[PDB]
């Protein structure tokens, strides 16, 4: 078997992350198809259909039965390298594989960074408003 | 950033295991050379030059400066699959790699087994002698 950190590169693992996925036989966005497109299922109490690309970290919910996950991935995250990987996992060279895993580690940092920015800016607006209000109480 | 279990497949890791190795520049069995041939350094108080193939688990000590580790590996463990791997690590496919790692896992078991056999036979010798000594009476 393989290290936990790398399991998501495996289609079978990705599929196994969907336990109560609602869209099964009859639907375009099945687990096989969500997984082939790179998604993991990471449902919340608030969004029980939330999926994430394991590679670029894009999150999507609001899935409908006729939705094609490849098309949707390609719409919301056109830059994602995974969409270029033509080869099956075992046909990859370790060099190719390690190269992918560095891009994924960069994409993860970028996601954490872009989050911290947003939270920072929300905080900064509160503090600015609070000080503005006090200068005004005048 | 690779899993501890798999590091020994990397030449630079293998070299790093040689800290107190006596045969350095000028010698045929340097760390670069020991490492290229598959060896890790696993010295004991009793055998400070003990080296082991990471892949087939063969152990060798009694190293001399003109010794070529590939030639020694071939001589004592001719069956070892690692001696066939012509490609650099990164040029391997994951399939090829996973295939190698299963063979290594089998080799390890076989060695644990060949150890347990030897310990068993040593214990049996002791018991035999003990019964012999008493029966002399
Ligand atoms: Zn993606
Ligand atoms: Zn060997």
């Amino acid at each position: 078997t393989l290290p936990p950190a790398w399991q998501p590169f495996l289609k079978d693992h990705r599929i196994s992350t969907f336990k109560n996925w609602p869209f099964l036989e009859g639907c375009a966005c099945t687990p096989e198809r969500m997984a082939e497109a790179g998604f993991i299922h990471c449902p919340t109490e608030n969004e029980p259909d939330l999926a994430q690309c394991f590679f670029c970290f894009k999150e999507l919910a609001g899935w409908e039965p006729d939705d094609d996950p490849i098309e949707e991935h390609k719409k919301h995250s056109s830059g994602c390298a995974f969409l270029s990987v033509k080869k099956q996992f075992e046909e990859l060279t370790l060099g190719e594989f390690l190269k992918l895993d560095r891009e994924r580690a960069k994409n993860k940092i970028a996601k954490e960074t872009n989050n911290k920015k947003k939270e920072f800016e929300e905080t900064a607006k509160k503090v600015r408003r609070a000080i503005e209000q006090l200068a005004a109480m005048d």
Side-chain angles (χ1 to χ4, degrees), chain A residues 76-85 87-89:
Chain A
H76 303 316
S77 186
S78 49
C80 174
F82 178 83
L83 296 169
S84 293
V85 159
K87 293 184 206 164
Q88 284 312 332
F89 186 72

Side-chain angles (χ1 to χ4, degrees), chain A residues 1-18 20-38:
Chain A
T1 84
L2 294 61
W6 293 350
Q7 312 234 20
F9 277 101
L10 277 170
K11 185 178 185 179
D12 279 351
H13 175 79
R14 297 203 294 286
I15 287 162
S16 85
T17 74
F18 300 85
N20 284 73
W21 187 245
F23 309 86
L24 307 170
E25 312 104 336
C27 300
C29 66
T30 51
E32 191 280 322
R33 275 268 156 286
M34 291 289 282
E36 199 215 3

Side-chain angles (χ1 to χ4, degrees), chain A residues 8 20 27 33-34 42 65 72 99 107:
Chain A
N20 284 73
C27 300
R33 275 268 156 286
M34 291 289 282
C42 41
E72 296 292 306
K99 190 170 166 188
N107 294 348

